[PDB]
Every structure is written in C-alpha cells, then in structure tokens.
Amino acid sequence: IEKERDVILREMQENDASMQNVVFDYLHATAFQGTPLAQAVEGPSENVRRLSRTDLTDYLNRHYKAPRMVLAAAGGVEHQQLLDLAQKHLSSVSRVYEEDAVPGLTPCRFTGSEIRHRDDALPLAHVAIAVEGPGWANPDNVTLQVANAIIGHYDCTYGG
Amino acid sequence: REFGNLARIRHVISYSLSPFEQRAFPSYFSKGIPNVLRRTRERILRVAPPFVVVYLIYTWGNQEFEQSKRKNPAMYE
C-alpha cells in the first residue's frame, strides 16, 4: 500500500506533465461539477495519501459483485471451455452486497461552463470544447460519430 | 497589442458558468443593500462635507443678500 502510494504519486506527477490529459480532466470537472463524473480516475493527492487498506477492501467488497462482471474472450477460444472454466473459477465471486444496499447510478447534471488554467510559459495551448452527449443507449451516437468523422482529426504529421 | 501577447500570467485558474445557467440577479436585494451601504460608508466622508459646506455657503449668501436688499432703519430722517 505504501510503496504503491509513492508509485501513484510519481505517476500523477508524470500525468500532469502530460498536457492533454490535464485538459480532459478539466473538461470533465467543469462539465460534470457537483456530480461523481467531475472527479478523475486517479483522484486527488490528499485522498491518495489518506485512504488506507480498509477503504480499499470496502470498495472491493462493494463494487466487485458478480452481476457487474463480464468475462470476455476473443480469438482461438471455445465458448464451452470458457464457460466450464468460468464455472470452475469465477463461480460465487461475491454475489452478496453484505448490507442489502445496492448503489444506484444517479444521473449527472451537465452544466455549460468554462475552466482556464493560464500558464504562459508553456509552449503550446490545449483547448477542448464540448457539449452534452446522448449516452451509450441512444441511437444518435451513430449520427454523431458520422458528424465527427466529417469534421475529423489532423496533426502536423499528416501529409495530406 | 491584441489578445495573446498582452500580459504574462502563470498558474492562474479561472472558473465561469453559462449566463443561461446562472441567475441574472442572484440575491439582488439581500446582498445588494449591504454592499451599497458599505460603499456609501466607505466613501461618504470624502464627498458629504464639501457638499454640506456648499449648502451652508449657498444659504448664507442668499440670506445675507436678502439682508443687504433689506432696508437699514438707520435712515429714519
């Protein structure tokens, strides 16, 4: 726990050394502020320093239930053999929340907003502009992906 | 000259919301009245004494002008 605490501290330093991840985290924070989607995957450094083994085991015993797990295999794999091995090993993984309190995934409020981290010593500027998307289950994702394919992507490496 | 090369600002983070998501008059009276009272208290002792002495000079000048237009009773004869 302590060695990895140092490891995530170093990796978060290297993550803020990278620049587009900072902008994506800032966009998520300013677009989903006040909701659990504002916080990044790594979490803040003070949380990294203070959370202990008990909190990790509580998270493990809360969010690693059987109905929230998919054993996905691709390639030269037989489905019958995969099913037999899942019955051998992944049978009765947790199946019990131990408190009969299933956590519900509430909607996250999107707010139109703007965050600026001005630091003029940096050589280039990273700007991300987004709006609220439809979600996974909406059929409009295909149309929005078509529009995003029309607009596209570009960098200085391209010889077009 | 234009935006981009005006100042040198580092390590400053700015937070803003949508005008269509925030109120145009957020606590307009319950916070507006104490702020106006505080500003008046801060800048009341620099303007009011000159304006009051203007009022005093105005009244004194009008009064003594009326008294100069008044008849002196020394000329009975």
Side-chain angles (χ1 to χ4, degrees), chain A residues 102-114:
Chain A
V102 181
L105 200 60
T106 58
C108 287
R109 163 205 61 191
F110 181 85
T111 183
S113 71
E114 166 198 20

Side-chain angles (χ1 to χ4, degrees), chain A residues 85-147:
Chain A
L85 286 158
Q87 286 265 15
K88 184 177 293 296
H89 301 308
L90 284 176
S91 177
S92 76
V93 64
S94 283
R95 178 70 274 172
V96 163
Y97 283 80
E98 291 178 352
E99 278 163 355
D100 306 319
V102 181
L105 200 60
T106 58
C108 287
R109 163 205 61 191
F110 181 85
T111 183
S113 71
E114 166 198 20
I115 197 165
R116 314 171 150 280
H117 194 171
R118 188 169 175 181
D119 180 23
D120 278 2
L122 281 185
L124 280 155
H126 281 66
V127 174
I129 299 174
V131 291
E132 165 69 13
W136 285 120
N138 219 35
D140 309 325
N141 285 310
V142 184
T143 309
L144 296 178
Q145 278 203 82
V146 163

Side-chain angles (χ1 to χ4, degrees), chain B residues 7-72:
Chain B
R8 274 271 321 300
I9 299 297
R10 302 200 46 196
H11 314 128
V12 165
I13 297 169
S14 176
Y15 299 122
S16 308
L17 277 181
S18 295
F20 298 95
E21 269 150 19
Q22 75 192 272
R23 314 219 291 280
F25 298 96
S27 70
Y28 183 48
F29 289 109
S30 68
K31 264 183 202 53
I33 298 304
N35 206 33
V36 169
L37 287 201
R38 179 201 52 86
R39 278 150 69 189
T40 300
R41 185 194 321 129
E42 183 178 1
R43 294 290 190 266
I44 197 73
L45 292 185
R46 289 94 181 273
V47 180
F51 283 29
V52 171
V53 298
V54 169
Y55 174 66
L56 295 189
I57 286 173
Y58 177 79
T59 61
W60 183 90
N62 275 330
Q63 183 204 130
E64 191 277 331
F65 186 49
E66 291 325 323
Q67 203 55 350
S68 62
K69 264 192 181 223
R70 274 301 201 231
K71 204 173 51 203
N72 189 359

Side-chain angles (χ1 to χ4, degrees), chain A residues 38 43-44 48 56 58 67 71 102-103 123 132 135 141 145 150 156 160:
Chain A
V48 163
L56 294 185
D58 177 41
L71 183 74
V102 181
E132 165 69 13
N141 285 310
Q145 278 203 82
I150 289 175
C156 53

Side-chain angles (χ1 to χ4, degrees), chain A residues 48-107:
Chain A
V48 163
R49 285 181 214 99
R50 55 191 191 61
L51 65 88
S52 56
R53 193 198 194 271
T54 304
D55 203 358
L56 294 185
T57 43
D58 177 41
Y59 186 84
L60 207 50
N61 301 4
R62 182 171 295 116
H63 294 101
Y64 272 43
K65 306 289 111 176
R68 311 156 74 156
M69 297 194 196
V70 174
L71 183 74
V77 56
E78 184 203 17
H79 184 66
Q80 209 48 58
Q81 194 183 5
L82 184 74
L83 179 61
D84 291 330
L85 286 158
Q87 286 265 15
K88 184 177 293 296
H89 301 308
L90 284 176
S91 177
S92 76
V93 64
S94 283
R95 178 70 274 172
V96 163
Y97 283 80
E98 291 178 352
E99 278 163 355
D100 306 319
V102 181
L105 200 60
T106 58

